[model samples]
Target: AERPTLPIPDLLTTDARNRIQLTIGAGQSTFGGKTATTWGYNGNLLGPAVKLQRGKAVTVDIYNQLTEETTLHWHGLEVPGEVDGGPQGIIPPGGKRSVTLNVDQPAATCWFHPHQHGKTGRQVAMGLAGLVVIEDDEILKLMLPKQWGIDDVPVIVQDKKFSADGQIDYQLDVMTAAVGWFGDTLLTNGAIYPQHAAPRGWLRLRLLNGCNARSLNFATSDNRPLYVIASDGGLLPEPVKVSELPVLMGERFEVLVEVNDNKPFDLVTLPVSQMGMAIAPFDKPHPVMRIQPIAISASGALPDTLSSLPALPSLEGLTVRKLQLSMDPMLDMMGMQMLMEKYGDQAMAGMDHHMNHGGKFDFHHANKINGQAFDMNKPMFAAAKGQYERWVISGVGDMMLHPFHIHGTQFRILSENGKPPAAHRAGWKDTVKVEGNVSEVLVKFNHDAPKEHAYMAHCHLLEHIDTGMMLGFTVG
Candidate 1:
């Protein structure tokens, strides 16, 4: 496929009352000269770019024009559980829901996407994701690229497969559901083989991994060091330079690329081995997008310090829990045929039972948190609001990586595999990649969630989530 021009989404504007209207409608999009049915927040394909300010109150009027039910989840936002758009936040066909939020978080590159149970993978794959840019006084004081689509850019990297007629195809088998739906084609900002013409100077790139289950190892063609300024939650205390960064599903990172010469460079995603083994078999690296510097422009250097993050609270007397990720053999022993017959093909399509681990079929439980599947009627754990707790999350059975995410709060990574976190991982994060070893995190909830409404923590892989990899916890 030839390189296509990068498409920048339109920035949404608010009215005088600080209210924005977002319509979730169905549309059609043509890719590779073929048309496919799609859904978006306010447009044909993906949603528009929304700007939010810190300490400001904003209301969003969300209208669902689709014939089915859907929920708009604001990923990485710290709103209350009622407005967090969890699995309980559902909008019926042709229904409207309004949510008002107090934007109290720091500056970062967040996102919004549909979070309906079994339909998340299908809807997101059909283009229903958008970017949310939050700004604060701290980030504005630093020297960075503020222009949209010019010097500062939003890069939404997703992968998809197409049918023989070039239309988007979302056929899922038992194997793909177990591990994840790995697409053969890469799309950046809704364009295949996209290229961006950048100004030769300090360019801030807000990189988002919107793929369903693929974890991307982003690197330059020349393996140049990309300056990392922020992570999922917000800006870091200082910049960390790295040659390659691993961005898992539902994770976001902000980096600064110094383009001093008028040369072309390709931003690519290299293959990564989870737990000392490859997740998918691939022959070569995939190009995310190409960057072509045109001319020399005003230059700037990163400051010595970016933002001051609060230190992790003391773990003394805090509730400590040991959790493990495993699969129940009983579920896998039944075999795929039996489960498919009982649950139906479409229902079992998202269930995980058979997975390729180490070139062999590992009949493990599809998705489980401590040997139990997701039970909406049960509360897995409980925590008092404003109390800090330490969660020791580990992956035990198979050698696979899981991007663990917690809703309604941000956390600090204490250690990984019994060692200090890497430079890039040393920041406030709402999602952390957990591998074969234990990953300890310190979390504190700021809002109250009752039994009827609880926050969720699960594997960010849409397939894993669709099955039973999620658990609910009450914070009150």
Candidate 2:
């Protein structure tokens, strides 16, 4: 069988004043070989690769032309809560929003997706997402893959369940309501089992796990070393070479792959056992894409040193806070499913939206953080302005893997189960995997997350995120 070629998104570079305009509307796309109704920003499917410069600001005028309301959230970028576009920044049908945000972090690959309170899962499933590539002066001086669509590429991997007729089938059943959704067919940049032809040299793949709840594992067909140069936030201090890499939803990585010969090799997915309820063979290893190297006259060498990351603050006797991730122990066993079966999906919809509308379920049971569901009117906590604090996060209840994410700042992972993080997981991160094991991070906020539009810390599992498993906090 012949595999389809990959699609590179159109890059929308900011103007001289660092501004870009975007419209959120519905469109039709044949990503699954059959035309499926979807949503996008300035495109028929997915969205464009938005380019921004470091130390510069971006003012975007957003037009929401979708039938329902949605918010555009810039994940992993260190902007203020107001401009961060959390659930608070709602854009209703025919609504408009203009936000100006300053970028002050190192070069990183971030993303933008719908963040509406309850409908986020559905909207993202319908293909409302895009890439945010940040460039900095320091990174510009480094010798890396600087070309776009030639040696540099964006691999947005997402799995989908399709109907027999090939239409996308998005659903949340009793099994997935708690464990989060999983798909059988995988797509890279909207093409199933796509292939790419790049120059036979060192190339960079900006990988993003753009799924609702799936955990991804990547390895080459020949199992060559993957030189990871950056994490969710920015370039790592040095390259961390690994044979296999595991990525959770909402996380991104920039890696360098050296393909010296013209032989076609594959970038494949390996089995990940730690993620929640197994969906059988779908959890096994699968192919992501095939890379066929072509001839190139000139190519830059892979640099040994990438960047200089700051040292983690001391860990001796610091203010430690505990964020325990859990679902209602009693209900999770089967109670919630029974209720949904009896009352039907309407009741579950009430719970899933979590105060988005006037939800029928109280904000106390089921999906929760520290024994309470998400409260739209409450401030769960606060962060310091000048110094750093230690946050020790662990899970309670189940064996499920929850990717915990913070909104505005990137923190350093100090330890995972009392040991340092693996080299591939050492860089600054805004999201980390937690599965009843302890994961500690040195946290600080460099932006103002006020009560009007506070920062959100929650599980990256879209279903869990909508049902509550989240909190809102401010920065002092």
Candidate 3:
């Protein structure tokens, strides 16, 4: 099968003052014939791909052209603290803010989206998002595939809930915070049932699971393995050969697919297989997207050597911090009922109409981190600058997933469920998902960074953050 060509846009050289306006709206689509509302870069549904070069200075002026307020966050990019664009830097209706980002980080695929506190999940679900890629000479010289618009592709996987009118609807209630909302329709590159053809050769794919709550257990329906080359931070020291990559929302992966000469195959992502433990119910299977080959061409051999990733610094002398996660079914169920009763069916309907599925709120106070409630007036784990500290995280109750994210510095996963760490997690990571029972990560604090913008540690579940599962720490 030949893969469809998707041209990677060239790195932009424009100044940091160039403005980009993204609008949110409802409209009709010829493909699905469904009346829908979508958020986009310039049109309806998802924004444009923002290309950038390493070491280049770029400014993205985001104007909130929608009815609601929005803020853009540069996820996975290491920049000056203030310009990261978290909740504090929101753009209200009819307002705008310009984010100056000096792209001095390693060459890798980064992303951008609304990062409004509490509303990050809802806003992102509506399509106020885009992709940002950083290229460097190190990646250019590799034998890995780099045939833009041909074998190489960029895929953003998201799901959506629709109303009777086929418009997106979202809700920020209580139940949603517990289990999180799962959508029935899968969207790729902001389109449904997206199909692309690839040429025969070693093809590169930058994949992102942009969905809310859903964790992607990606595999080819035909049982072919995907060669993973990189993760959220950048390329792995060596490629990992696996049949599946369990990618959570906010996590990204770069995969290389070697298609035999003129051989056609399907590239697919669907609900996880339920062949194992029964800790959770099985989710229905649905097609995420399709990959069809168009022609055959020899590119280059899969690189035997990739860039060297600096080993994560040791946490031996650092302070040992621990976070425990508890999932009380009784509390969760009761909270859901109470919220629904108070908000009523009308509120639920509004949520569904806006692409919000379920009754969960992103900022519920019952979801605690380290046995402490989220308090903006307080700080957790305060320490002097440059102090080396070790932290441990645990999921105390129910079998659940929590991607523990730390601002300012990345961490290394020391163990999971008391077992050895996954081989792929040997590099630095700002976010680490805690598996149920006994997941622990050791992080060394480079607290030398300033104080005004304190570091944050929180569940990456955006809705969970809205529901009070977030906390900030000071390293001065």
Candidate 4:
């Protein structure tokens, strides 16, 4: 089958004061050769890439034109909790608000998506997500592709399932809500089986694993090494070369691929660690997009070193906190079936209107953290200023891997399952995937997060997040 050309969303750069206008509205999209109703931020599928300069005060004049309420979260940006755009910062339908914050972190590939508890999965899966590119003087001086859409590109890979008529369905059934949803097809930048054309030089690709629960292991068709330059929070100390890069949900990585010749290569996804053993289905490895080199010649350089990272805080005698992320959504189907047996379908209609599902069954709290579901009103943990702590996050489930994510700050992963982390995961990160045992991280909150608008630490799987696999914490 022929592939569609990759679509590049325009860059919305801030003006003199570093501010821009963004909007979320309903629209239509063509997927699998059929028109499907979708939503976007300022567009039909995804929003424009909002560019930000470090150490600048910026404002986003956002308008919510949807028929329902939602919130915009800067997924990897380090900002105050009030402006962090979690569940508390809700925007009613047809409402307009201005969000202001100062960028104080290094250059990184971040994202913007709605963080509402119950509706986030549907909104994001339908189309409510975009990329945020942060630039700094240090990276500008480095040898890298500075142009956007020419040599540098944005890649948002999302797994999606289309109905028989080609419409994207967001309705969660008993099993979908329990085990989290996984699509049979993959969408790269809102298109299926897409292809991109790039110039000669080391083509920079800012990739994001936008899947709800599925993880992605990126590799080339020819099995070439993917030179990784940056991670979720910011650039690594240097470029790390790896054959395959595994990026879980909500995680981003900036990689460089040398496209000197006209030969085309397929960017495919490999099997993650213990894919069938840990995750739900054994999906066949698939291609995301094909990269075809253009006629243009090279003018850039690929330096060995990219940026210098700050020293990690000592972990000796640190306050340790254990968090257990447990789920057996696969087995929960049995209980849901029993609910329909004892109480008629009418008894489960209470969640129908709230979950946007038809008369079908709906369930909540399918997954949890520390044996507690997400309660916006109650904070699971609290800390004062200048307090550095440690978290031992464990995936206590038998059927799924959890990508543990925390808002309000970027943290350092010390070890995973009693050993040091991989080379690609050694840099600053806000989200880390847990397979079997546990992953330990060192985090400190330098920003104020009040109890009213506290920070959140949860699974990045959108469906799991909506089903209550999250925790709220305050740093004041």
Candidate 5:
């Protein structure tokens, strides 16, 4: 798999708004000496950004040309289930699906990626992902910087393990699945040693921590706050200024930063024990990427006032559900050892090698919600037309963080242990960070009834998901 040196497909642009076309596939690349499996948007890697308006309709023609079956999933869009792109809409090899999305949601950052059953991990890891920028007249009216490549830029930070020749391999094994997979190399905007040209004054950046299992503690090289402006859903009611932010995989953040023109600073996500850190993982800070500034004039000034965010609706009268997650760490628990014994060393050895790419799997490390693995047919929660629901998520383990996300509806944080929810989270959101102890979210079923299809609720940790921490929910 040769590193696709092709110019980055300009995924986000303000010049053209709305209409977009995307193609997903595996193509020949000479990155390493061997021809490896790879997936991408226009070519062999991630696709270009498709910038759109907040209230406009978007038509996307998705073409799949991969060797295996694949499906496209809109990570944070409020479209009908069919247009949402999930397992139900699998695109077989050489087939394509045309989806029309009418944007009627708030202004925020979303994304697209492969969502095939049991294979989302490999597909997305191979570069089958891209950003979706939704804008509005209100956001456009803000005095924030928007210098495109200069200051305002979309930063997708990911960790990857590569071969000697620099190709990414996404094979999962038993043990690796239990703990998780992390790469040695860090990537920004899909480029190694990537550099961003920034101007003096305030600049806005949309950040996505797209790693498989790593949760990022983001801070400036000099230990300064990143000036947080938004979270997963959109802009906060007011800026929640913070020196550090923990961004789990699949989570998004918007920050306002100021830098002296021509000055340079490093943006880093500290190392952890999983990355084989020698010191206390939380205390060791590792360099993630460099942000170089150029001597350029400021294009715009950020406004003192920002867009008005709607109030967080009350959770009164919403239905309530509780979900519990557990992990079993025995290899023979899932009958995997018996299967290997039946197949003998030759066949079992090949299976072992293939699964090892994703790391080692342990059935004892088995992840479960409410003591069971993900069963697509099992609906976690269902509701008739206009019912609201309160979901209580309690973690069974203290070793991991679960960025719980629900599709098709926006939720309000009512209370955490009967305490008031964070003010920063009092806005429309579909994703909520569930700390290791216990957490709860209140959501109303507002999307089209019968759902178009069932939506998903899962751990945002990509490796955990690839291993087994995911489930689906349907609305009648």
Candidate 6:
């Protein structure tokens, strides 16, 4: 098969006042010469890239053209709960909603996607995702790749299945709903088997795992070291070189790669096992994208130090909280029926709701955060504003792996499995992977949470999230 050239998405327009217009609608796209239905922010497939700067007040005019209801959630943005685009921030069919907020977070690679209650997985799978580049003066001064689509590349990695006629097919079964929808084919920026030409120097790859459930164990084919410069939150104190890095769903990592040689190399995803069991069918390595040093312009080298991160606050007055993740097959189906019946009238009030096959299998296993399914009306915990707290999250029973994510704030990983985190994970993060051991993080709620609207902390796996492995928290 021929290598598919990677496609760079267009950046949304921002004026002097940092304002942009975004229109979300449904369209038809042709993949492999076969047409399929899809959704996007502007075009036919995935949405455009949005560039934001710290300290700037940005406003977006959102127009929902989709037949069904949808909500736009900023994945890694630290904003107020009302404007955070949670499930309650739903946009009805042909509805128009405008959001304006100040960009306050540090430099990081975040993303925006649909976060509807039960339609998140299918919406994202059908292509309703985009990249958000947050820039700051500190990171801009570093000697890193700044040119987009050339030295600095945005790679959105996902997986999808296709039918015999090359149309996109979504297969959601009982087992898939319990875990995730793991596709057979790998995709980079909506392209199958894509390849990119890198400049003959240092290059930065902003990798976003946009898959619904797949965890990518990223590594170089020749076992070359990848200099990881940033994690989910922002840039690290210094770059850490590693042979392989595990990137779970909804996670982003920025790595610096040196392409000095003219020979072509592959950035591959190695076989990964969870809880001593193989998750993917392929037992061998899978090449995600091929890279060749063929750029005419010279590239820059990485700096010795990236950025200085603030020291973690003292734990003297911190209140420790405990949370557990588990799954119950019986309770899952029951909760699903209850939620659908309760919210069905509201969700289908003035929209064209289609009952697909996946809707029937929506409820299966009861994925729980604190032994209870997600309840939008009730908050699991309450936090005082400006109070720092330590949360210890652990996976109970025979669960494989759960990537726990908290919204509205960034956190520092204190320990994993009762030990200090790895070097790459020493920086700030918004999501942490918890296996059978305990993972502790120190976080603070800087923004106020309203009584009707609350922030969420849930598993990044879309399947688990839809089922109920989520909890709502309030900060007052």
lDDT of 4 at 108: 91
Highest TM-score, which number? 2
What pairs collide in candidate 2? none
For candidate 2, the 10 contiguous residues with the lowest summed lDDT are 346-355
Q: Show pairs that collide, candidate 1.
A: 352-366
Q: Flag the better candidate by TM-score, 2 or 6.
A: 2
Scored by lDDT, model 2 comes in at: 0.81
In model 5, the runs with Cα more than 4 Å from the true position are 1-9, 12-19, 27-37, 272-283, 313-316, 329-365, 384-387, 415-426, 449-452
Residue-level lDDT of model 2, residues 313-364, one tens digit each, is 6778778888887786644656355545644553323121312434444322
The candidate, 1 or 5, that scores higher on lDDT is 1
lDDT of 3 by residue, 95-198 (tens): 77677777765667777777676778888877776777778878888867766556667888876667777777676655567656555666777666666677
Candidate 6, residue 135: lDDT: 92
What's the residue-level lDDT of 279 in candidate 2? 42
- Model 1 has a clash total of 1
Indicate whether candidate 3 or candidate 4 has the larger TM-score: 4
Ranking by TM-score: 2, 4, 6, 1, 5, 3
Report lDDT per candidate: 0.78, 0.81, 0.64, 0.81, 0.66, 0.80
Residue 273 CA error for candidate 6 (Å)? 1.0
Q: Could you give candidate 5's per-residue lDDT for residues 96-178 as a string of tens digits? A: 78877777767787777877777776777787888887877877777667766566777787766677655676666553454
lDDT of 3: 0.64
Model 4 over residues 325-394: C-alpha lDDT tens digits? 8764543654445435644453233131334544223356657788776788899988655678898999
Better of 2 and 5 by TM-score: 2
lDDT of 4 at 280: 24
All candidates: TM-score = 0.89, 0.91, 0.83, 0.90, 0.83, 0.90
lDDT of 4 at 20: 92
What is the lDDT, from 0 to 100, of the residue 213 in candidate 5? 66
Query: What is the Å distance of residue 304 in model 4 from its true position?
Result: 1.3
